[PDB]
Amino acid sequence: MARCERLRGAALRDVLGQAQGVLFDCDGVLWNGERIVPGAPELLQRLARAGKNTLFVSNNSRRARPELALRFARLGFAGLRAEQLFSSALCAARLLRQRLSGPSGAVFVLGGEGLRAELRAAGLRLAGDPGEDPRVRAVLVGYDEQFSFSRLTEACAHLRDPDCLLVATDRDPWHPLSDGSRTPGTGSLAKKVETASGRQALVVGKPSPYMFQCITEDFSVDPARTLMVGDRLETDILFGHRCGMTTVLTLTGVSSLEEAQAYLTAGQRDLVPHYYVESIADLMEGL
Ligand SMILES: [Mg+2]
């Protein structure tokens, strides 16, 4: 029964000591734009040497795994493997691969090159690619910098066919840019498409539990022995509760302690973290 307690001292040593793994959200937790959270790279190294699994979850779709791995290495996060990285783009690609199996058809993507790349790596054919004309069997909505009313209308035409799937990477209100600014996230486009088409999308990214299924397909992950660390209550903490994980709010990102406390006293227990730290650097003393 959470809680929102301060994670340090004996509590920290116990909670971290029993943990077999830690799942980290990235933006607002490891970094903000190109500003790394002080102590973040060292924590990850200490966790690995402590024998604990470290996995990474993000609703950012700008980078496919290879490029995402290269980013981690640039900001000073060494010794990570691509297999530890779980983006909403990766999980959407794997969902679509399964649903479009039994080999037919193509995916119409509202989104960028990183998303397209992950889909191609899952062996999916895309509607915008050459040798065109295949039937569109799914529309995938992701963060789309080049969105236009022309492509919305195109997407809705494909969705006239009830058999055409509608999938969204996530419903985040905001997408963080490298320069510290932000712009509306997939949430706005998803609702636009859902409203225009009169449909409800299959959402794969957190707080959807499907992201967790994606993870547990590749890794042995006991949710009762795993910490979920994030900076947004409505996405990361909710995700943790839905998956049965211990949740930790870090304060270096979007959500504030006051917000955490407002949900508590308002009875929204799924939006209240079990614990909080000022930054993930504070977890290092538990090791
Ligand atoms: Mg975040």
3-state secondary structure the chain: CCCCEECCHHHHHHHHHHCCEEEEECECCCEECCEECCCHHHHHHHHHHCCCEEEEEECCCCCCHHHHHHHHHHCCCCCCCHHHEEEHHHHHHHHHHHHCCCCCCEEEEECCHHHHHHHHHCCCCECCCCCCCCCEEEEEECCCCCCCHHHHHHHHHHCCCCCCEEEECCCCCEEECCCCCEEECHHHHHHHHHHHHCCCCEECCCCCCHHHHHHHHHCCCCHHHEEEEECCHHHHHHHHHHHCCEEEEECCCCCCHHHHHHHHHCCCHHHCCCEEECCHHHHHHHC
Residue 21 near residue 55, CB atoms below 8 Å: yes
Q: What angle do CA 249, 71, 30 make, to 5 degrees?
A: 15
Same domain for 214 and 76: yes
Is 179 part of any known ligand binding site? no
Same domain for 201 and 93: yes
CA of 29 to the centre of ligand 1 (A): 6
Same domain for 192 and 83: no
Method used to obtain the model: X-ray
For residues 278 and 267, give the distance between their C-alpha atoms in angstroms, rounded to a whole number: 23
Same domain for 165 and 250: no
Is 59 part of any known ligand binding site? yes
Same domain for 242 and 231: yes
Contacts of 31 (CB under 8 A, 6+ apart): 37, 40, 75
CA of 162 to the centre of ligand 1 (A): 34
Same domain for 161 and 149: yes
Confirm whether 27 is a catalytic residue.
yes
Q: Which two tokens stand for residue 188?
A: 């706005």
Same domain for 77 and 213: yes
Domain boundary, last residue among 159, 190, 205: 205
For residues 24 and 253, give the distance between their C-alpha atoms in angstroms, rounded to a whole number: 13
Same domain for 201 and 92: yes
Residue from 14, 27, 163, 236 carrying the catalytic annotation: 27
Contacts of 211 (CB under 8 A, 6+ apart): 57, 86, 88, 91, 204, 205, 239
Q: Could you list the residue range(s) of the whole structural domain that residue 152 is in?
A: 88-205
196-200 contacts at long range (C-beta below 8 A, 24 or more positions apart): 196/152, 196/155, 196/156, 197/155, 197/156, 197/159, 197/166, 199/159, 199/166, 200/166
CA of 27 to the centre of ligand 1 (A): 4
Is 231 part of any known ligand binding site? yes
Same domain for 102 and 173: yes
Domain boundary, last residue among 148, 176, 205: 205
Q: In CATH, what number is assigned to the domain containing residue 275?
A: 3.40.50.1000
Total number of domains constituting the chain: 2
Contacts of 43 (CB under 8 A, 6+ apart): 280, 281, 283, 284
Is 206 part of any known ligand binding site? yes
Confirm whether 222 is a catalytic residue.
no
Domain boundary, last residue among 151, 170, 205: 205
Same domain for 163 and 63: no
Q: Which two tokens stand for residue 141?
A: 């909505």
Same domain for 195 and 92: yes
Same domain for 211 and 197: no
Q: What angle do CA 221, 227, 230 make, to 5 degrees?
A: 120
Instruction: Find where tokens 């929204």 sit.
Output: 268
For residues 118 and 62, give the distance between their C-alpha atoms in angstroms, rounded to a whole number: 10
CA of 31 to the centre of ligand 1 (A): 9
Residue 34 CB neighbour total at 10 angstroms: 11
Amino acid (one-letter) located at 133: D
CA of 197 to the centre of ligand 1 (A): 30
CA distances from 158 to 21, 76, 118, 138, 170 (A): 42, 44, 22, 8, 20
CA of 230 to the centre of ligand 1 (A): 6
Q: Which two tokens stand for residue 122?
A: 């899952």
Is 60 part of any known ligand binding site? yes
Residue from 25, 170, 236, 282 carrying the catalytic annotation: 25
